[PDB]
């Protein structure tokens, strides 16, 4: 299980994909996940939500024609989701947030 900022960041840069311990919101749901229950770890042990498209709604991350952003949960083990996320783009720019998207820090 790779779920730390630099572990996932380096992995994204080296393999152009998230580690295997990541599944999208729809995949988690197909497995019985109910966010309000905080049962992700029960329905998919060792898994964390990640891989879904990030719409960059506040326009905080650098937007460019042709660039799409995606996000993934960081430091999640079990129970309810936390406030940490790693954000990666199609051209591999990497950012992180630890305050539920209020601010971001470029790490790659």
């Amino acid at each position: 299980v790779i779920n730390t900022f630099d572990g996932v960041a380096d992995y994204l840069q080296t393999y152009h994909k998230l580690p295997d311990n990541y599944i999208t919101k729809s995949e988690a749901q197909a497995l019985g996940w109910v966010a309000s229950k905080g049962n992700l770890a029960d329905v998919a042990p060792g898994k964390s939500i990640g891989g879904d498209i990030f719409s960059n709604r506040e326009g905080k991350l650098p937007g460019k024609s042709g660039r799409t952003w995606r996000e993934a949960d960081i430091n999640y083990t079990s129970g309810f989701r936390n406030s940490d996320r790693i954000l990666y783009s199609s051209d591999w720019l990497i950012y992180k947030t630890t305050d539920h998207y209020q601010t971001f820090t470029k790490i790659r």
């Binding site: 919101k25 966010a35 309000s36 506040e58 936390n82 539920h100 998207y101 209020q102």
Partner: protein, 90 residues
């Protein structure tokens, strides 16, 4: 079956709106109070079915300078994405 109410005439800031949503939706204490935090809460935290009743929308649209519209847009996209959300605009 989660119910949420917004009395628009009482919203004087975009912050008022986000703090109101935090309470009515039972969002996490770390709730980012922004469009991206809202999308994440509606799609990976909030309980469904959900019913959002937004009263005096127009009035709240004024004191938030079209920010209310962007908030509503997130609920609608969360809805088109599969979320069982019923939106009442009165």
């Amino acid at each position: 079956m989660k119910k949420a109410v917004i009395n628009g005439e009482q919203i004087r800031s975009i912050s008022d709106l986000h703090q109101t949503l935090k309470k009515e939706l039972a969002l996490p204490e770390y709730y980012g109070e922004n469009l991206d935090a809202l999308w994440d809460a509606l799609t990976g935290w909030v309980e469904y079915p959900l019913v959002l009743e937004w009263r005096q929308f127009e009035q709240s649209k004024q004191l938030t300078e079209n920010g209310a519209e962007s908030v509503l847009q997130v609920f609608r996209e969360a809805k088109a994405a599969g979320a069982d959300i019923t939106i009442i605009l009165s």
